[PDB]
């Protein structure tokens, strides 16, 4: 019915008017490309050949467009159509008369998409504003869209079969709009959290931590090769940090050339000892933490997620706030190129040697588990004797579960800490966790020491069978193993019952992901529909479509969210 | 379906060795001993002969499309 | 400012293997020689197949791929042969190619194994390394395979079918002394076959003055070329690449000035 | 084409007058025939009226030379014998 | 023992039997995170292999068969009953867990191009097209014949030379996209000759015809099935996964010279990023690499039953130490470009990698001024129909946040469904307009002078007309 | 025709009446890989609606030990609503109680 | 409004810069005369950027205040946001 | 216009608009024979 | 005659029941094929439990 | 479908120059050499031999993109020396080294056989 | 804080708590087409037709539906040509 | 899969 | 119906869906394919 057509989603009101299928759009699998800049995207030749951007013939560009017309559709840098002044369209594929090929001012030649053509790149779902950014086009000889790895974080995209949509603006006006509003370098900092959206990620973060260590010393030829990939190099080789006996540069010395202009920033490394700031060696840090950049030169410190990541006060954030968006784009690209070429010399790996720990550490983990199981047994025996006293506001069952969970959690964390102590400097799990590229201390603990308690619906594994978790356990068994505690690590391998309980926990995780996607989508749509028309007028009042004053000034201070920074008042706290 | 010429990783010709490998296995050589006798030394080459599944015999069971 | 004078000692020389040590050479030169072994030594292999009848279970392109991978003896004729692009004649002629023809039909009840021996070449020099045999396909009774193929000169940069070598083993600094690789636990690592250290010491003491030298090689052949000829042809081909670069560079230098 | 190009600045919603429906509809006398086909293809005073819209992607509707693109379609009216509540 | 239960009534035959068919192919399942086993169960259904030994006889749509399937070097005991050895899906691949050039970052994979040239992960894609000669029509007969442009009033300019006399292309003829696989003609009633009814190849198929069959179907009409074969060499978009839930595309392909090489000359067929392992905690992958190295050297297929208690990482490591390699499986690698030893020692070992059905060639689509829908006069939908990608409501909200009003206007009006209407000035209702006659008149006002041209999306015109049919009057007044 | 229609369409009932018909039965067999064929044959489908996001029918239950594979479930909108039998599981054919 | 009593920001907004550059570039593509001497610049957008730097773009921006009045700021009068 | 037969593998020439049945076996499943034109296969 | 019942492949009432693998090859049916599916209108359909 | 032909990696298409010499404005006595249809093989040898020269202050090679086939070699020499001269001399030295290596490898072959 | 405060201000601007639902949002006296895009659709249109409501066409969604330039950024202002400046300068082409 | 306070 | 070519057969096209004069390439009809879109039993019902 008419109401049926209009009412539902995919109806005329929403499925054909608010959103609709569009021309000049392309889609294919995305794959990595560290060599492309932040703004560049790699477009396949077939996608580039099908998509055409109409160019008006001017006296300036008549020769170039004439050559494109002569090439035709077959040769790649060609023109699919000619649009005359009358509006007549001459498809060049079917034979055009040599008279038709002649061009005069006012004709519109539809050239194939070429390098440097601005496009809009999208990945569904388009949760936030950074999910649609304008990319310059670079044509490369394979059939996948190729984008830089730093740009993956705004899109929330990884290269495991993901796909993205390519929309080509078809007019100079809309092309200029994209160029000056939606380009990737222009949206490095989000107004949502006044932090940079994009940060150094994956191999480049892991390798920047290793590159910026005090240990790293580079010989002359390696410095040559690293400087070759620096786009903004002045052409002057820095004086080596160690002139004699053999000239040897340092990783910080080369990274200082990457840092844009003169940027001043102080951040702390992840492994910074808390006591260091108070005690001596505060400025001469023993562990080479406390990153300090003075006059755009890395005086000291080991770079990590905190310094080069997506957080407020990061080196990239200070670069965007101080140097500008263009120099910051060059900064991102140069970090990636130089560090990735040094990683060929150094290399990264993950093996079983990382998962395995010392025999003493294994014995310590086992002893912690033994005494934890004994403590849980003691709590159970107290409960059976009714000696246990209920916690206020909780039933005896709830307080028993609380105490048992506390004991098991304390043992789990202690075993994890023992495993983390066992890790050497060379351990690669620790390299990735310390750099912040991937993983966490929890993952290391589960890999090496103890997987941990499996919880479903906020409780230990429930009694699915009559008063027992699995048929193998005895009825009314509230012990650690029965209710889900996985003593073995992933490396050691889970026992079969622990395997089933672990599967139950993982299933809860998967279900939560599936549910959250839909519910969050509905919430986001409702918020947008409620606030879509609110905008800052030229009175600088924030008004809706009805012109009702939502706010007299935007944010009550009339400032945009991206420019602001965290600061301390310093008059508030001190005593009189 | 059939033993690949030229082991993928290095390129040593391993396609001439499948029937010899099967014959050595019939001679009660262990698979490692047969691989050693055939001259396959690197584990990349040994993977080819050890993990090969000869489906072409099963395909040859079917009568030809044209006689 | 001049080239180092290298030396060569050949420790082993067999029909399918050459072991040699190049000394007084830079690492870049040695690695480039290793690279030229794999990708820039010309060999003759099948690149054109016209299949007249294929009743086998494997499809036509499968047969073509397997035929391409079959090594062909190219010891001396490969230097005489010209690249098909260089030859003036249209398509393929005896100067720019070698013609292989295969006709096999299974009339016996027993399965017929089509082998490389069934490939017949018009040129005696180029033969499929037969003088077991590589199994192209197996044929049931009533199944026939007839095809005609031409073999062209090329190197491994185009396709791996033109890769002369099976495995090129390159190793320098067998006992870690320049500390190019930093072992987390030196003791666990197996000692190199070329290592000169005693069993007690896992690594040689660090030598800051030392630079990579005395590179160890082990070149194995597929039979397409003699293992000695692979090394000699690689050295000659790299020399030719450098000479072509020099000619073009001289042209550009003179033209600019 | 001679008409000046204008952008809508206000959309007025109202219930369509029955008299206005009668005047506006190109069909006169209503749709008298349930069948859509007369004379083979076109049924005047039927559901598929040549005046109502362009048919077959090559024809021209009677009211204007639409050629399947220019014509926006034209409404018709059915005079119900006895009035019916609108749902 | 210390008394736990003395009244056992039944015993499990083996704990590994709790797993199903797809989960049984996972080696060392107990050493992986649970979501990763769940993900591998789904990925294994999409892997490529010989699906059935009678695939030559069968004419199925979308059949992929790998060139050189291999059985796993590390296999579960329950795999024998699944017949996985008989019909394997995947190739054991020398896999290095390393960061080489940055093209393996995220989940992507660097593959060896020389190995790909030697047959590694090469597959065939068979697509079958069915057509039926239907004579059921009263005066319509869909005869099989080669259409002729002069004889047939309805025809298309695609290539018709391939078709033989029967209207069916012969086996062994290459077919590029937009070629006529089957030529069929419907005789046209002469109301007062031929509307073309040929079937055309899916764009970019680029295959060679394998089998052409002519039979009579259940209805008794002549039935023709044509199978087109396309070889599929792996590219830099194809998706490859292991048995431990690690899926990823091919970032780039390097030749054997460029790939890092061990001292023995072994270059990894596949390089995977080290960053995939820690967050996902798929230690079973690492244990499979170690066991595969041991198995390849020893010559015996490794055992990876989930719960064994006789196979430990330490035992595998000692076994590997016997065969001359580092006990943890790390190997000293040399950089292919420069020859220098990589300072970190890379973890190299054979691992069973699979090839998933998702390939870039099937997933690449570009649209530019294509056909439009009938009802909405908007671009079509789907790759088969050359459909444009949808600019959803979330996309328009992002563009509003940008402030790109004109790009939003182009994308939502000018690119999709531009249209023009004529609207009476006196009454907002649209007015009849004859451009060729140049007479523009509005019914209901008897007014001709006051008419204005309005540019609106065709969907908006359709919405307003559907409102009018419901007796709502959307009077759009320019004033 | 009744048996053939119910098998082909996937709707369990009569052609004329689709109100009581249950869709999702009698799917086309997956032949991508032998594993896919086997798993498709050994499959269970929970009748709970996919649209409902209530999580109780989706969670793995303790009683599924050895009867249903714990790992093999579709990830997406049907997590835990489609299940696969374990290797040794055998559904009872049925017998008379006399 | 009068030329006096202009209350809007003297700085050119980002959206105004985008639309002015795009519109002026579309004019330049249609063979409009170019105020700024071009140093071998053929792309219309780049010539528009040069004109914007020289503050010679012949466009006056009319800013609509929410009360219905408008203030006409010439592109030259507005301070470039850059 | 020569159709190979599935059941007995005997080629039978069939004219246009002629029943698809193989003489000497009666089977109704025919295959068209391989084309005479030859396709160049790159060994790559 | 009251109708026709679709037959699940390799069940007791199918033609393939109790056939040696060589005979299955002679019928161009794979020995390893599991069975358990109906061939309705030329497509193999599986009844999901 | 968009796969480049294999011969494109080493074959110069018509109208392409094997070497193009462009000076570097940033620093004195520096030239930037672009070599088309060449890979790490030639670049590493040339850079190494240049680094051995005492008068060469800077020498490095860069492949701008692995999918494309091009080498960019930057050579900076001291005054009284030209970057182009350094490039030519490096090529002569590499050729001499390779020729000497060929002679000694032939001698080693002849000695290993029948000796 | 700006983004939180804006939502709080839109919900409590009218003086009665406006839920972000079909009820609260559609009850506010916005344009009928804008209400139509959110949830209720046809019912909103029917009510608007019955009461003779007029759409001001000042909203973003309403302009997007009719294909007109939105009043959003880059559409807030109208550019005008400056004749006097066109006369000045060097008119090379 | 860790604990009651962590993740499942 | 190419205006410059009296009695000219316009070739159909599938890529954009238009009939094009083959001797000059003029596009006659812009998007005039669109989608381009039991009578035996009983009759009209
Ligand atoms: C990371 O978030 C993404 C996005 O949110 C997007 N997405 C995915 N599915 C849906 C869906 O159904 N509905 C909506 N709206 N969005 C969806 O996909 C999510 C992750 O899913 P995953 O958790 O499987 O990603 P791995 O962690 O698995 O990545 P491996 O290691 O395989 O490469
Ligand atoms: Mg992903
Ligand atoms: Zn090998
Ligand atoms: Zn010739
Ligand atoms: Zn009309
Ligand atoms: Zn009117
Ligand atoms: Zn017959
Ligand atoms: Zn014409």
Automatic annotation (TrEMBL), chain D:
Localization of this protein: Chromosome; Cytoplasm; Nucleus
Any coiled-coil regions, as ranges: none
Ligand binding (Zn(2+) 1): 61, 63, 71, 74
UniProt binding sites for Zn(2+) 2: 61, 64, 71, 74
UniProt record similarity statement: Belongs to the RNA polymerase beta' chain family.
Task of the protein: DNA-dependent RNA polymerase catalyzes the transcription of DNA into RNA using the four ribonucleoside triphosphates as substrates.
Protein name: DNA-directed RNA polymerase subunit
Organism listed in the record: Sus scrofa (Pig)
Gene transcribed to yield this protein: POLR2A
Full protein segment contained here: 11 to 97 of 1970
UniProtKB/TrEMBL annotation, chain G:
Presence of keyword Ribosomal protein: no
Biological processes per GO annotation: transcription by RNA polymerase I; transcription by RNA polymerase II; tRNA transcription by RNA polymerase III
Subcellular location field: Nucleus
One Gene Ontology cellular component annotation held by this UniProt entry: RNA polymerase II, core complex
Keywords for this protein: DNA-directed RNA polymerase, Nucleus, Transcription
Primary localization class, coarse: nucleus
The keyword S-adenosyl-L-methionine is assigned to this record: no
GO MF annotation terms: DNA binding; DNA-directed RNA polymerase activity
Record-given protein name: DNA-directed RNA polymerases I, II, and III subunit RPABC2
Organism: Sus scrofa
Lineage: Eukaryota, Metazoa, Chordata, Craniata, Vertebrata
UniProtKB/TrEMBL annotation, chain H:
Binding site for Zn(2+) 6: 27
Keywords in alphabetical order: DNA-directed RNA polymerase, Metal-binding, Nucleus, Transcription, Zinc, Zinc-finger
Binding site for Zn(2+) 2: 8, 22
The protein's role, per its UniProt record: DNA-dependent RNA polymerase catalyzes the transcription of DNA into RNA using the four ribonucleoside triphosphates as substrates. Common component of RNA polymerases I, II and III which synthesize ribosomal RNA precursors, mRNA precursors and many functional non-coding RNAs, and a small RNAs, such as 5S rRNA and tRNAs, respectively.
Compartment(s) where it occurs, according to its Swiss-Prot or TrEMBL record: Nucleus, Nucleolus
Record: residues binding Zn(2+) 5: 24
Origin superkingdom: Eukaryota
Protein name listed in UniProt: DNA-directed RNA polymerases I, II, and III subunit RPABC4
GO molecular function annotation: DNA binding; DNA-directed RNA polymerase activity; zinc ion binding
Similarity-based family: Belongs to the archaeal Rpo12/eukaryotic RPC10 RNA polymerase subunit family.
Keyword Metal-binding (UniProt): yes
Cysteine disulfide links: 5-22, 5-25, 8-25, 22-25
Residues that, per the record, bind Zn(2+) 1: 5, 8, 22, 24-25
Residues annotated as binding Zn(2+) 3: 22
GO biological process, one term: transcription by RNA polymerase II
Positions annotated to bind Zn(2+) 4: 22, 24
Cellular component GO terms, alphabetical: RNA polymerase I complex; RNA polymerase II, core complex; RNA polymerase III complex
Species of the source: Sus scrofa (Pig)
Automatic annotation (TrEMBL), chain I:
Subcellular localization(s) per the UniProt record: Nucleus
Function comment: RNA-dependent RNA polymerase that catalyzes the extension of a non-coding RNA (ncRNA) at the 3'-end using the four ribonucleoside triphosphates as substrates. An internal ncRNA sequence near the 3'-end serves as a template in a single-round Pol II-mediated RNA polymerization reaction. May decrease the stability of ncRNAs that repress Pol II-mediated gene transcription. DNA-dependent RNA polymerase catalyzes the transcription of DNA into RNA using the four ribonucleoside triphosphates as substrates.
UniProt record similarity statement: Belongs to the RNA polymerase beta chain family.
Name of the protein this chain belongs to: DNA-directed RNA polymerase subunit beta
Highest classification ranks of the organism: Eukaryota, Metazoa, Chordata, Craniata, Vertebrata
Residue range from the parent sequence: 225 to 273 of 1251
């Amino acid at each position: 019915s008419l109401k049926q057509r209009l009412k539902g989603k995919e109806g005329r009101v929403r499925g054909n008017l608010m959103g609709k299928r569009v021309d000049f759009s392309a889609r294919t699998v995305i794959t990595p490309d560290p060599n492309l800049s932040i703004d560049q995207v790699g477009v396949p030749r077939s996608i580039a050949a099908n998509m055409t951007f109409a160019e008006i013939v001017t006296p300036f560009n008549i020769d170039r467009l004439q050559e494109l017309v002569r090439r035709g559709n077959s040769q790649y840098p060609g023109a699919k159509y000619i649009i005359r002044d009358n509006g007549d369209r001459i498809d060049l594929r079917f034979h055009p008369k040599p008279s038709d090929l002649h061009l005069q001012t006012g004709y519109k030649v539809e050239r194939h998409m070429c390098d440097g053509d601005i496009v809009i790149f999208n990945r569904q779902p388009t949760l936030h504003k950074m999910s649609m950014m304008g990319h310059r086009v670079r044509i490369l000889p394979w059939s996948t869209f190729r984008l830089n790895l730093s740009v993956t974080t705004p899109y929330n995209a990884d290269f495991d079969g993901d796909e993205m949509n390519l929309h080509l603006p078809q007019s100079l006006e809309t092309r200029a709009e994209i160029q000056e509003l939606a380009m990737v370098p222009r949206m490095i900092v989000t107004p949502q959290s006044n932090r940079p959206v994009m940060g150094i990620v994956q191999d480049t973060l892991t390798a920047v931590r290793k590159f910026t260590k005090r240990d790293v010393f580079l010989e002359r030829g390696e410095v040559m090769n690293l400087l070759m990939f620096l786009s903004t190099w002045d052409g002057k080789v820095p004086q080596p940090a160690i002139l004699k006996p053999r000239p040897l540069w340092t990783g910080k010395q080369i990274f200082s050339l990457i840092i844009p202009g003169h940027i001043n920033c102080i951040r702390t490394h992840s492994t910074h000892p808390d006591d260091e700031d108070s005690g001596p060696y505060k400025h001469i840090s023993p562990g080479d933490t406390k990153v300090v950049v003075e006059n755009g030169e890395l005086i000291m410190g080991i770079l990590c997620k905190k310094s080069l990541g997506t957080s407020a006060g990061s080196l990239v954030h200070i670069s965007y706030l101080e140097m500008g968006h263009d120099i910051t784009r060059l900064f991102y690209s140069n970090i990636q190129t130089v560090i990735n070429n040094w990683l060929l010399i150094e290399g990264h790996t993950i093996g079983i040697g990382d998962s395995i720990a010392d025999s003493k550490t294994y014995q310590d983990i086992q002893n912690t588990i033994k005494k934890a199981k004994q403590d849980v047994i003691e709590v159970i025996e107290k409960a059976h004797n009714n000696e246990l006293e209920p916690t206020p506001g909780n039933t005896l069952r709830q307080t028993f579960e609380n105490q048992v969970n506390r004991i098991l959690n304390d043992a789990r964390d202690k075993t994890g800490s023992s495993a983390q102590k066992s890790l050497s400097e060379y351990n690669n799990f620790k390299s990735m966790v310390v750099s912040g590229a991937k993983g966490s201390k929890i993952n290391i603990s589960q890999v090496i020491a103890v997987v941990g308690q499996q919880n479903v619906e906020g409780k230990r594994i429930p009694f699915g069978f009559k008063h027992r978790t699995l048929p193998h356990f005895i009825k009314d068994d509230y012990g650690p193993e029965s209710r889900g505690f996985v003593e073995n690590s992933y490396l050691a391998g889970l026992t079969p019952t622990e395997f089933f309980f672990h599967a139950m926990g993982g299933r809860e995780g998967l279900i939560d992901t599936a549910v959250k996607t839909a519910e969050t989508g509905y919430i986001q749509r409702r918020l947008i529909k409620s606030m879509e028309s609110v905008m800052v007028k030229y009175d600088a009042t924030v008004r809706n479509s009805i012109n009702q004053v939502v706010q007299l000034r935007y944010g009550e201070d009339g400032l945009a969210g991206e420019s602001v920074e965290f600061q301390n008042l310093a008059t508030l706290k001190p005593s009189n | 379906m059939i033993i690949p010429v030229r082991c993928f990783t290095c390129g040593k010709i391993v396609g001439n060795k499948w029937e010899a490998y099967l014959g050595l296995l019939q001679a009660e050589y262990t698979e490692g001993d047969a691989l050693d006798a055939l001259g396959l030394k690197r584990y990349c080459c040994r993977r080819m002969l050890l993990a090969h599944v000869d489906l072409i015999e099963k395909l040859l069971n079917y009568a030809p499309l044209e006689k | 400012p001049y080239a180092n004078q290298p030396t060569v000692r050949i420790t082993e020389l067999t029909d399918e293997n050459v072991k040699f040590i190049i000394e007084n050479t830079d690492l870049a030169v040695a690695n480039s020689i290793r690279r030229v072994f794999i990708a820039e030594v010309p060999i003759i292999a099948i690149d054109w197949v016209q299949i007249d009848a294929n009743s086998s279970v494997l499809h036509d392109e499968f047969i073509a791929h397997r035929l391409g991978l079959i090594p062909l003896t190219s010891d001396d004729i490969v230097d005489k042969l010209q690249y098909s692009r260089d030859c003036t004649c249209e398509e393929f002629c005896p100067e720019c190619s070698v013609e292989f023809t295969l006709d096999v039909r299974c009339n016996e009840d027993q399965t017929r194994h089509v082998t490389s021996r069934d490939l017949i070449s018009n040129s005696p020099r180029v033969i499929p390394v037969t003088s077991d045999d590589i199994l192209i396909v197996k044929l049931r009774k009533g199944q026939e395979l007839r095809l005609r193929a031409y073999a062209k000169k090329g190197f491994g940069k185009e396709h791996a079918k033109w890769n002369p070598t099976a495995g090129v083993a390159f190793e320098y600094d067998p006992d870690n002394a320049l500390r190019h690789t930093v072992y987390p636990k030196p003791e666990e690592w197996p000692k190199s076959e070329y290592s000169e250290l005693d069993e007690d010491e896992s690594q040689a003491p660090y030598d800051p003055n030392g630079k990579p030298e005395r590179f160890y090689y082990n070149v194995e052949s597929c039979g397409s070329l003699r293992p000695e000829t692979i090394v000699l042809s690689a050295l000659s081909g790299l020399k030719k690449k450098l000479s072509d670069l020099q000619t073009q560079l001289s042209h550009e230098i003179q033209s600019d000035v | 084409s001679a008409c000046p190009l204008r952008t809508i600045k206000r959309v007025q919603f109202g219930v369509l007058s029955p008299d206005e429906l009668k005047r506006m509809s190109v069909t006169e006398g209503g749709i008298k025939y349930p069948e859509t086909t007369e004379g083979g293809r076109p049924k005047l005073g039927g559901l598929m009226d040549p005046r109502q819209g362009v048919i077959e992607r090559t024809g021209r509707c009677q009211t204007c030379a639409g050629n399947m693109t220019e014509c926006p379609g034209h409404f018709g009216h059915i005079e119900l014998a006895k009035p019916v509540f609108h749902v | 023992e210390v008394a736990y239960c003395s009244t056992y009534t039944h015993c499990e035959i083996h704990p590994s039997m709790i797993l199903g068919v797809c989960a049984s192919i996972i080696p060392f399942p107990d050493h992986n995170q649970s979501p990763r086993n769940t993900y591998q169960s789904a990925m294994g259904k999409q892997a490529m292999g010989v699906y059935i030994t009678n695939f030559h006889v069968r004419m199925d749509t979308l059949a992929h068969v790998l060139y050189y399937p291999q059985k796993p070097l590390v296999t579960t005991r329950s795999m024998e009953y699944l017949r996985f050895r008989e019909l394997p899906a995947g190739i054991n691949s020398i896999v290095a867990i390393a960061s080489y050039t940055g093209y393996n970052q995220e989940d992507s994979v660097i593959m060896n191009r020389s190995a790909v040239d030697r047959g590694f992960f090469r597959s065939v894609f068979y697509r079958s097209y069915k057509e039926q000669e239907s004579k059921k029509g009263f005066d319509q007969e869909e005869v099989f014949e080669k259409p002729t442009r002069e004889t047939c009033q309805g025809m298309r300019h695609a290539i018709y030379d391939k078709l033989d006399d029967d209207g069916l292309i012969a086996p062994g003829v290459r077919v590029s996209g937009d070629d006529v696989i089957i030529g069929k003609t419907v005789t046209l009633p002469e109301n007062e000759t031929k509307r073309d009814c040929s079937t055309f190849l899916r764009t970019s198929e680029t295959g060679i015809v394998d089998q052409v069959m002519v039979t009579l179907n259940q209805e008794g009409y002549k039935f023709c099935k044509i199978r087109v074969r396309s070889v599929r060499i792996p590219q830099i978009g194809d998706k490859f996964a292991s048995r431990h839930g690690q899926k990823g595309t091919c970032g780039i392909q390097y030749r054997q010279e460029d790939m890092p090489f061990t001292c023995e000359g072994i270059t990894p067929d596949i390089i995977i990023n080290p960053h995939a392992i820690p967050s996902r905690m798929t230690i079973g992958h690492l244990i499979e690499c170690l066991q595969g190295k041991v198995s390849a050297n020893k010559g015996e297929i490794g055992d990876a039953t989930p719960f064994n208690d006789a196979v430990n990482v330490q035992k595998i490591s000692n076994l590997l130490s016997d065969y001359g390699y580092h006990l943890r499986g790390n190997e000293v690698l040399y950089n292919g470009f420069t020859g220098r030893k990589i300072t970190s020692q890379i973890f190299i070992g054979p691992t069973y990698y699979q090839r998933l059905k998702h390939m870039v060639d099937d997933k690449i689509h570009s649209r530019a001024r294509g056909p439009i829908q009938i009802l909405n006069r908007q671009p079509m939908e789907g790759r088969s129909r050359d459909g444009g990608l949808r600019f959803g409501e979330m996309e328009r909200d992002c563009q509003i946040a940008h402030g790109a009003a004109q790009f939003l206007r182009e994308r939502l009006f000018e690119a999709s469904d531009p249209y023009q209407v004529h609207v009476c000035n006196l009454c907002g209702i649209m007015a009849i307009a004859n451009t060729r006659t140049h007479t523009y008149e509005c019914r209901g006002c008897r007014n001709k002078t006051q008419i204005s041209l309005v540019r609106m999306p065709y969907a908006c015109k359709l919405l307003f007309q559907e409102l009018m049919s419901m007796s709502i009057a959307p009077r759009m007044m320019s004033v | 025709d009744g048996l053939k229609y119910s098998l082909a369409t996937g709707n369990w009932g009569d052609q004329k009446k689709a109100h009581q018909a249950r869709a999702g039965v009698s799917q086309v067999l997956n032949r991508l890989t032998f594993a896919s064929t086997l798993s498709h044959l050994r499959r269970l489908n929970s009748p709970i609606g996919r649209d409902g996001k209530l999580a109780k029918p989706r969670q793995l239950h303790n009683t599924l030990w050895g009867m249903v594979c714990p790992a093999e479930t579709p990830e997406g909108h049907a997590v835990g609503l489609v299940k696969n039998l374990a290797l040794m599981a055998y559904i009872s054919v049925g017998s008379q109680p006399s | 409004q009068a030329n006096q009593k202009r209350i809007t920001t003297p700085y050119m907004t980002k959206y105004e810069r985008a639309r002015v550059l795009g519109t002026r570039a579309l004019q330049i593509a249609m063979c409009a005369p170019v105020m700024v001497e071009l140093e071998g610049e053929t792309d219309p957008l780049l010539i528009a950027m040069k004109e914007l730097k020289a503050r010679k773009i012949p466009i006056i921006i009319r800013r609509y205040l929410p009360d219905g009045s408008y203030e006409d700021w010439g592109v030259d009068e507005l301070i470039i946001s850059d | 216009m020569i159709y190979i037969c599935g059941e007995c593998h005997t080629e039978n020439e069939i004219k246009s608009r002629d029943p698809i049945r193989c003489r000497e076996c009666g089977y109704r499943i025919m295959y068209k024979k391989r084309t005479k034109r030859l396709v160049v296969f790159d060994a790559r | 005659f009251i109708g026709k019942i679709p037959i699940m492949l390799r069940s007791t009432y199918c033609l393939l029941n109790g056939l040696t693998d060589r005979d299955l090859c002679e019928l161009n049916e794979c020995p390893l094929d599991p069975g358990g599916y109906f061939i309705i209108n030329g497509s193999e359909k599986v009844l999901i439990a | 479908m968009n796969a480049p032909p294999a011969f494109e990696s080493f074959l110069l298409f018509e109208g392409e120059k094997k070497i193009t010499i462009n000076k570097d404005t940033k620093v004195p006595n520096a030239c930037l050499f672009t070599i088309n249809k060449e890979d790490h093989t030639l670049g590493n040898i040339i850079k190494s031999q240049l680094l051995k020269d005492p008068q060469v202050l800077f020498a490095g090679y860069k492949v701008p993109h692995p999918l494309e086939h091009k080498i960019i070699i930057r050579v900076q020499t001291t005054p009284d020396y030209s970057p182009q001269e350094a490039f030519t001399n490096a090529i002569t030295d590499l050729i001499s080294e390779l020729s000497l290596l060929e002679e000694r490898f032939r001698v080693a072959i002849k000695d290993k056989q029948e000796g | 804080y700006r983004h939180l405060a804006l939502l709080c201000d839109t919900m409590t601007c009218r003086g009665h708590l406006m839920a972000i639902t079909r009820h609260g949002v559609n009850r506010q006296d916005t344009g009928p087409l804008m209400k139509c895009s959110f949830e209720e659709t046809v019912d909103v249109l029917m009510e608007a037709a019955a009461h003779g409501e007029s759409d001001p066409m000042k909203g973003v969604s309403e302009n997007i539906m009719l294909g007109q330039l939105a009043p959003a950024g880059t559409g807030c202002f109208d550019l005008l040509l400056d004749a006097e400046k066109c006369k000045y300068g060097m008119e090379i082409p | 899969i860790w604990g009651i306070g962590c993740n499942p | 119906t190419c205006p410059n070519h009296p009695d000219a057969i316009l070739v159909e096209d599938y890529r954009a869906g238009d009939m094009i004069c083959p001797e000059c390439g003029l596009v006659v009809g812009d998007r005039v394919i669109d989608v381009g879109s039991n009578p035996l039993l009983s009759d009209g019902d």
